[PDB]
Amino acid sequence: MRHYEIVFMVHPDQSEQVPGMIERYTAAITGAEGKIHRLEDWGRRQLAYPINKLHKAHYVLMNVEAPQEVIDELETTFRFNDAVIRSMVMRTKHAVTEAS
Amino acid sequence: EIDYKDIATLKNYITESGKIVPSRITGTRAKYQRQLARAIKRARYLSLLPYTDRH
Amino acid sequence: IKVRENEPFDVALRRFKRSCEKAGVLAEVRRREFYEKPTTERKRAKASAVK
Amino acid sequence: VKCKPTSPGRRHVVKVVNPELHKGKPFAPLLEKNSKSGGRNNNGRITTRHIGGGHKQAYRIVDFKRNKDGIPAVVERLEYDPNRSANIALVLYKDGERRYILAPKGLKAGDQIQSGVDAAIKPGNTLPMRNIPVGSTVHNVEMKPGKGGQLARSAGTYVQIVARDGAYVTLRLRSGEMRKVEADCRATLGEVGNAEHMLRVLGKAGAARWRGVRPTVRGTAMNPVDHPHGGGEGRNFGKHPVTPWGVQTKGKKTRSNKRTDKFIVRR
Amino acid sequence: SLSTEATAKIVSEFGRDANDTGSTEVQVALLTAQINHLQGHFAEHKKDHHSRRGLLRMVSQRRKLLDYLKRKDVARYTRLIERLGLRR
RNA sequence: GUUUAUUAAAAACACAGCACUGUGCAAACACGAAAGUGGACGUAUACGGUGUGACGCCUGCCCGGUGCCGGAAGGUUAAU
RNA sequence: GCUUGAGUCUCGUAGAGGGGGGUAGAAUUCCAGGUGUAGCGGUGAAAUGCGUAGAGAUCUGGAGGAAUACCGGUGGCGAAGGCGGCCCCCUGGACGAAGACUGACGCUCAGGUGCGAAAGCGUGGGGAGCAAACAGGAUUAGAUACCCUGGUAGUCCACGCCGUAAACGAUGUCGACUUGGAGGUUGUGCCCUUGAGGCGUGGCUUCCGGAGCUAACGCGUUAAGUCGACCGCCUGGGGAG
RNA sequence: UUUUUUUUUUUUUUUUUUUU
């Protein structure tokens, strides 16, 4: 129930696969009774540093009322996704119900 | 300043040396000051505060 | 640290990067670093400068 | 051998400190499925493998391939192998069958032992590496794609997967990190079973080496009738090589089938 | 750290009349039960010196508390060890 | 100890660890003219070089010569 | 019988966390092929290598080695040592509190119990970049040498006999000490919260105030001026560790 | 907080008594 704050970064152009992939990642959270403050499409943003050779990602940001019980099964299903550039997590000091 | 929304309005508190300014200019209250110190941190690592010119 | 000059007579508009990220980054390293002893020296320096 | 369960040697009240004090892994009878090896060196005729001593070879554990992957199983008991130092288990396949599988340090409960193409991932019978994740531990590895495993022991020998290496052509081991064997070969997991049986000497001598073989003990030394030295007088003291074939560094190969070794850093 | 299905019975069966919920016999019965509770999950986490102290702590005070009740009130002390033992 | 029965009776030394070494593997060895039988029902912590000299430390040091081989910047000068 | 020394529950809280888990990123080696004609390092002055078998470099494509750079402080924790990225679990110490319930269950310690900077023993190894040793060309009154390219160990350490030195109020246990005010700081009660903190208050730290005390630098109440429970250590030169 | 322009130059015997 740690009010996690988690970003990840797919390949910039797979815009038809990211919505079927967004259903498929909330899946873990919902299958655990965890609840979602926000789930932001960030978009096709360009990069700070030279990673993955398309010069952009497509990001997501979300805020989850969920337990430690899923954070590795997310760190797993990001790190085994051959098309995911980077991902990170932050926790607590309340949620963020309002967008960026 | 506890959270992200007002720190997107407060991007003037950044030096031409690209970092978060020493407050002598205006002297902020140590409570109001310490709140912004954590909201800067979370914004720095997500990159909603894009740290300096190139990034 | 990426500076445009323009109609290039060589303008020297590149001056202002001396502010920190070009230069003041070397107060540790020179061939070699200082290594031993600079770390309270950092606040030793303040009791030299009060005027 | 900092590890546990270790079994550390005895207080000196007998001639023996070693052997290995491992209670709880010899057993009898030799169960129904067993076989043996036979005669002595007997090559037809004049045997090149020196010293022999060939009595009690004797018996071996019979299960090679182990290719039943998909059908789940459980752990009955675990044993030992006097031919390899190997930690092997007796495995009951929930279909109706009993089998002998090569194991890590204490794999019991009787756990969930299964494999299958992308379907499973646990320490599993034999299992294809282009369908599971990346680590140090892998174990069985068909010495080439359908022939049979490379390692019949869990003696410590980590083979180490690399992720996407020149398109599936993987591993990173000891003496040739350019094996380039494709990940279409079969794993099982994993390489430390009983390090305790091998990482330390069992004796000086022991049952392991004098009840049914003689090891090597000389070549050069005594009776000049076999090796390139020499006169007499206790002396030795010349240049005397392992002739016509060599010793201390040269290499031996130039051409073979498959031949996959490429860069070779050696030393 | 035990269940309220346990605290709420400890209370009843080692209290006197009213509000004994924190007195020397109800304190022994809560320490005793909590020490024994902890024995049933201590086999996990495997490096756990960071928690084993405050357990050592409570089960050293359990001994001290008892030897203190002896010196103060012998005929409470006896009755209490006739039910729970803990004499170690 | 019983191991060179045949000068010695061991005052011989068979332990056994290991840095290094031969095999990324139709492996090293080829005995038989065709074996693939030792090793193998097995992988470079399996088996062999040359040894080791309880155990435990300790291997300082120093590359002239001379070995061990490896290589190619380059000449001595070949079947090609 | 009490002052409540002492605890447990209960309610709250924030960082460079005791020990297992995960891992965000400069440089720059050497190679696979893209190129440019010859000179890169290095110094008191340059060297042994290298260069019509093209001195680096610098893109493009690969293979290895796993520093913590910094919201970073004009600082924060901590018994010391001792990390700095943030974090999963076990969750040191806290320690700010309405209360609740028992009544000194209390202080402080020798031989001991643990921890234990430098270092040996390690058993198998993880084997970047620097630099004692290692290797040399050099500057040579002998260099037995500093360079300067090459250079390990030290980087840390699963596990563990670790005494131990430089961890000096040159110094432990502390209770009253109530002329005090002056800062650095920090949890915080009260204000039309008009405020750059005004009326306040405990803590963690320092500034430097009498009567005394008193060599000369002055130290000036928690501090050496009174006053106390010892677990010590204190046997003078050279005998010595 | 980079501070190697050479390293070394034998012994003595200097001393105008004392109580204040």
Coordinates of N, CA and C in Angstrom, one line a residue, chain A residues 3-41:
Chain A
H3 N 2.1 3.7 -1.7 CA 2.0 4.9 -2.6 C 3.2 5.2 -3.5
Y4 N 3.6 4.1 -4.1 CA 4.7 4.1 -5.1 C 4.4 5.1 -6.2
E5 N 5.4 5.7 -6.8 CA 5.6 6.6 -8.0 C 6.6 6.0 -9.0
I6 N 6.2 5.4 -10.2 CA 7.0 4.5 -11.0 C 7.0 5.0 -12.5
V7 N 8.1 5.3 -13.1 CA 8.2 5.5 -14.5 C 8.8 4.4 -15.4
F8 N 8.3 4.2 -16.5 CA 9.0 3.4 -17.5 C 8.9 4.1 -19.0
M9 N 9.7 3.5 -19.9 CA 10.0 4.1 -21.3 C 10.1 3.1 -22.4
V10 N 9.1 2.9 -23.1 CA 9.1 2.0 -24.3 C 9.6 2.7 -25.5
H11 N 10.1 1.9 -26.5 CA 10.2 2.4 -27.9 C 9.2 3.4 -28.3
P12 N 9.7 4.6 -28.9 CA 8.9 5.8 -29.1 C 7.7 5.6 -30.0
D13 N 7.6 4.7 -31.0 CA 6.7 4.6 -32.1 C 5.6 3.5 -32.0
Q14 N 5.7 2.5 -31.2 CA 4.7 1.4 -31.0 C 3.3 1.8 -30.4
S15 N 2.7 2.9 -30.9 CA 1.6 3.5 -30.3 C 0.3 2.6 -30.4
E16 N 0.2 1.5 -31.1 CA -0.9 0.6 -31.3 C -0.7 -0.5 -30.2
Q17 N 0.5 -0.8 -29.7 CA 0.9 -1.8 -28.7 C 1.0 -1.3 -27.3
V18 N 1.4 -0.1 -27.0 CA 1.3 0.6 -25.7 C -0.1 0.6 -25.0
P19 N -1.3 0.8 -25.7 CA -2.6 0.6 -25.0 C -3.1 -0.8 -24.6
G20 N -2.9 -1.8 -25.5 CA -2.8 -3.2 -25.1 C -1.8 -3.6 -24.1
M21 N -0.6 -2.9 -24.0 CA 0.4 -3.0 -23.0 C 0.0 -2.3 -21.6
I22 N -0.8 -1.3 -21.6 CA -1.2 -0.5 -20.5 C -2.3 -1.3 -19.7
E23 N -3.3 -1.9 -20.2 CA -4.2 -3.0 -19.7 C -3.4 -4.1 -19.1
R24 N -2.4 -4.7 -19.9 CA -1.5 -5.7 -19.4 C -0.6 -5.4 -18.3
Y25 N -0.3 -4.2 -18.0 CA 0.5 -3.8 -16.7 C -0.3 -3.4 -15.5
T26 N -1.4 -2.6 -15.7 CA -2.4 -2.5 -14.6 C -2.9 -3.8 -14.0
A27 N -3.0 -4.8 -14.8 CA -3.3 -6.2 -14.5 C -2.8 -6.9 -13.3
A28 N -1.5 -6.7 -13.1 CA -0.7 -7.0 -11.9 C -1.3 -6.3 -10.7
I29 N -1.5 -5.0 -10.8 CA -1.9 -4.1 -9.7 C -3.4 -4.4 -9.3
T30 N -4.3 -4.4 -10.2 CA -5.7 -4.9 -10.0 C -5.9 -6.3 -9.5
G31 N -5.1 -7.3 -10.1 CA -5.0 -8.6 -9.6 C -4.5 -8.7 -8.1
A32 N -3.9 -7.7 -7.5 CA -3.5 -7.5 -6.1 C -4.3 -6.6 -5.2
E33 N -5.4 -6.0 -5.6 CA -6.3 -5.1 -4.9 C -5.8 -3.6 -4.7
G34 N -4.6 -3.4 -5.2 CA -4.0 -2.1 -5.5 C -4.8 -1.1 -6.4
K35 N -4.8 0.1 -6.1 CA -5.6 1.3 -6.7 C -4.7 2.4 -7.3
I36 N -5.2 3.1 -8.3 CA -4.4 3.9 -9.1 C -4.8 5.4 -9.0
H37 N -4.1 6.3 -8.4 CA -4.3 7.8 -8.3 C -4.3 8.4 -9.6
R38 N -3.3 8.1 -10.4 CA -3.1 8.5 -11.8 C -2.4 7.4 -12.6
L39 N -2.6 7.6 -13.9 CA -1.9 6.8 -15.0 C -1.9 7.6 -16.3
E40 N -0.8 8.4 -16.4 CA -0.4 9.4 -17.3 C 0.4 8.8 -18.5
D41 N -0.1 8.7 -19.7 CA 0.5 8.9 -21.0 C 1.2 10.3 -21.0

